[PDB]
């Protein structure tokens, strides 16, 4: 059938980018690697500013919508590649979008408001949340990181309770690159082997 | 009390801009003129490139979000000016954002989805819709405007059912600058007198 959309979510420095590259290289040549935010586009450009320069002041709602817009500008290419039989591994997506913004506790910006902009976007066939027991960019402070992990758990737990079986939480506490690799593969392989119709897609 | 938020909506070439400038000169010195989209900012610049150059390709969902983000990056200063007693004349706001986008008929982008990103925004104290019974920018085509007109009507008609009385539909057909001005004023003057508490606002 069509390729699979695999997502790996988690806190900055949990081994996310590494396991993504590892999974990507192991799925060649019919696999593409996608990173969010996608900083090479014009919208991704303002997102890069915001994250690397605090003089660039932008309200919480504005930057939030830019992050969702950034996914919407690329989504059509994703759907296309999947149809051409290629697999796609993503480093962050909708879940990071909601969590990092909701952890701020800004008036009006709760979990539900935060998701809305992303409603209609392609939903991953499988989402892996890597969890455990710098400072260059805006959200890089131990105190904030603790809050987003709290929100992440709140969000995912809600979705799983609601019946979403495509979400799997992997505890990578004190485990090596290859042990974590084996854990992830133990989960992804069986989904790569299931046949999915070209016409079947899930959306947020 | 606080200054009042006055909004004038409508189709391109309905006299909307000239009326806003007339009202502004009439409320000055204690008044500010604000136009959306505000193409002065970085996000506004992206909006501008999309509207002035059809070479610039961007998904409907992505541009829609940039339009909302453009409002969200200015709203704090709007609120601030009202608290200091200054009145604000606004040329286009969230109604244009929902109408011009839902008119496209793109799958998933209905009146509902289109409104979500603007939820939580300061609702204007008075909304005047200029109704009637160029070509160097995107959207500026006779066939599209017809769709936008019918979209505005369905939207505004909806808000009326819900109980919003701040929306007034002013028919400007075959009328001159001065006559329309008189109509606008007969609706604006009352509101400008009505006492509004320093901290009372309506939101979307
Ligand atoms: C994709 C995405 C990431 N982010 C943040 C997470 C990251 N914050 N930190 N630390 C930041 C940069 O991400 P990367 O380090 O993964 O490039 O963007 C959001 O706020 N929303 C989103 O939609
Ligand atoms: C403020 C705003 C304007 N628009 C469109 C309306 C106008 N369309 N045409 N033709 C366009 C530019 O309007 P102005 O000429 O008033 O600058 O922006 C939206 O699509 N959504 C919005 O949120």
Pairwise CA distance, residues A63 & A141, whole Å: 18
Name the helix (H) or strand (E) containing A97.
helix A94-102
Pairwise CA distance, residues A127 & A159, whole Å: 12
Pairwise CA distance, residues A202 & A127, whole Å: 13
Q: Crossing angle for the helix pair B60-72 and B42-52, nearest 10 degrees? A: 140
- Cα atoms found within 13 Å of the Cα of residue B120, Cβ hemisphere only: 20
Two tokens, residue A18: 């590494």
CB B118 within 8 A of CB B93: no
Chain B interface, best mutation among A38, A65, A78, A121, by max B CB count within 10 A: A65
Q: Crossing angle for the helix pair A16-25 and A177-192, nearest 10 degrees? A: 50
Q: Structure resolution in Å? A: 2.4
Contact residues, chain B, for A65 at CB < 8 Å: 65-66, 68-69, 72, 117
Solved with: X-ray
> Tokens 């979209």, residue?
B151
Distance from CA of B78 to the nearest CA of A (A): 13
CB B122 within 8 A of CB B78: yes
What domains can you pick out in chain B, each with its CATH number?
1-204 (3.40.50.300)
CB B130 within 8 A of CB B172: yes
Two tokens, residue B72: 């969200």
Pairwise CA distance, residues A174 & A183, whole Å: 13
> Tokens 């019918």, residue?
B150
CB A188 within 8 A of CB A26: no
CA angle at residue A89 from A195 to A144, to 5 degrees? Answer: 130
Chain breaks in chain B (C to N over 2.5 A) after: 133
Nearest to B118 by CA among B99, B133, B135, B134: B99
Pairwise CA distance, residues A4 & A100, whole Å: 26
Residue A70, Cβ neighbours under 10 Å: how many? 23
The radius of gyration computed from the CA coordinates of chain A, to the nearest angstrom, equals: 17
Contact residues, chain A, for B46 at CB < 8 Å: 42-43, 46
**Is A7 exposed, middle or buried (CB count within 10 Å of its CB: 0-12, 13-18, 19+)?**
buried
Give every CB contact of residue A135 below 8 A, 6+ residues apart in sequence. Answer: A141
Ligand 1 atom nearest the C-alpha of A94 is: 23
Tell me the pairing of strands B122-123 and B202-203. antiparallel
CB B39 within 8 A of CB B47: yes
Pairwise CA distance, residues A59 & A139, whole Å: 14
């Amino acid at each position: 059938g069509r390729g699979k959309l695999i997502l790996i979510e988690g806190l900055d420095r949990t081994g996310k980018t590494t396991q993504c590259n590892i999974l990507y290289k192991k799925l060649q040549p019919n696999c593409k690697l996608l990173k969010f935010p996608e900083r090479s586009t014009r919208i991704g450009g303002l997102i890069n500013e915001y994250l690397t320069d605090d003089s660039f002041q932008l309200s919480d709602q504005a930057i939030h919508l830019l992050f969702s817009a950034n996914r919407w500008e690329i989504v059509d290419k994703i759907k296309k590649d999947l149809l051409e039989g290629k697999n796609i591994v993503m480093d962050r997506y909708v879940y990071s979008g909601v969590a990092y913004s909701a952890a701020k506790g800004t008036n009006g910006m709760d979990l539900d408001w935060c998701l809305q902009p992303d409603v209609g976007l392609l939903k991953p066939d499988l989402t892996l949340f890597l969890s455990t027991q710098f400072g260059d960019e805006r959200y890089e402070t131990v105190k904030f990181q603790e809050k987003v992990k709290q929100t992440f758990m709140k969000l995912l737990d809600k979705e799983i309770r609601k019946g979403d079986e495509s979400i799997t939480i992997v505890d990578v506490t004190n485990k090596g690159i290859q042990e974590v690799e084996a854990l992830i593969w133990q989960i992804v392989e069986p989904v790569l082997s299931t046949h999915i119709d070209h016409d079947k897609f899930s959306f947020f």
